[PDB]
Amino acid sequence: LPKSVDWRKKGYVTPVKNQKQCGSSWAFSATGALEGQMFRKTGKLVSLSEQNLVDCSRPQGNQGCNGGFMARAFQYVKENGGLDSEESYPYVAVDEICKYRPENSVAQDTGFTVVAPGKEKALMKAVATVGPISVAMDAGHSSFQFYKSGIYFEPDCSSKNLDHGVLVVGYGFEGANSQNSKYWLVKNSWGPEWGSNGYVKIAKDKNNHCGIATAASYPNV
């Protein structure tokens, strides 16, 4: 595998978005993974509709602004036959009536692939070979809310109890040694202003920190 990967540098990632006051990180993580897969498939980067997911995926088990899961979102895209673009179905950060329009669909999936659980090595292979990957993590600490730069490492982080969906867009290391000070490049949905231009470097190969490899997946396009 490569020593480092950064899908942002290859055009697979949209600019950072902001979920605002709605517990929709699961939707942002899902559209991020679909955006990278549609880009790999067609060469066109199109921002997808998290609102489409928020308003319409209740049957698949999601709860809009009250929470959900990326796998349920990919299930909805598969069952629904499509997903609208953000331009056509804008994000408003509140639960609204489902307004899916098939004529406006710009993405599709036949289901999804799950990365072997808890395996950071399996996650690194998926990131290097597929593109950005949806992952769940434990973001429930003040150190994460206030993160600004460097490799994030929180001793109280759990690898089992997860509460926020994010997107792994790559991995790398600090310094000249490729085997130390390793990190996962993660795109968050708290706006460009949070963290490092909206991203966070999470410690890699340090016992699956914050559970990044615990429940990872990607849509099959």
From Swiss-Prot:
Q: Glycosylated residues: list them.
A: Q108, Q179
Q: What is the protein name given in its UniProt record?
A: Cathepsin L2
UniProt family annotation:
Belongs to the peptidase C1 family.
Q: Which GO terms describe its biological process?
A: antigen processing and presentation of exogenous peptide antigen via MHC class II; extracellular matrix disassembly; proteolysis involved in protein catabolic process
Annotated Gene Ontology cellular components are:
extracellular region; extracellular space; lysosomal lumen; lysosome
Question: Keyword annotations for this protein?
Answer: Disulfide bond, Glycoprotein, Hydrolase, Lysosome, Protease, Signal, Thiol protease, Zymogen
**Top-level taxon in the UniProt lineage:** Eukaryota
One term of GO molecular function? cysteine-type peptidase activity
Which cysteines pair up through disulfides? They are C22-C65, C56-C98, C157-C210
Q: Where is the active site?
A: S25, H164, N188
Disulfide bond as a keyword? yes
Briefly state the protein's biological role: Cysteine protease. May have an important role in corneal physiology.
Covered residues, full protein: 114 to 334 of 334
Name the gene for this chain.
CTSV
Enzyme Commission (EC) number: 3.4.22.43
Activity regulation behaviour: Inhibited by CST6.
Phylogenetic lineage:
Eukaryota, Metazoa, Chordata, Craniata, Vertebrata
Q: Which reaction does it catalyse?
A: The recombinant enzyme hydrolyzes proteins (serum albumin, collagen) and synthetic substrates (Z-Phe-Arg-NHMec > Z-Leu-Arg-NHMec > Z-Val-Arg-NHMec)
Location of the protein in the cell: Lysosome
Tissue and organ distribution: Predominantly expressed in the thymus and testis. Also expressed in corneal epithelium, and to a lesser extent in conjunctival epithelium and skin.
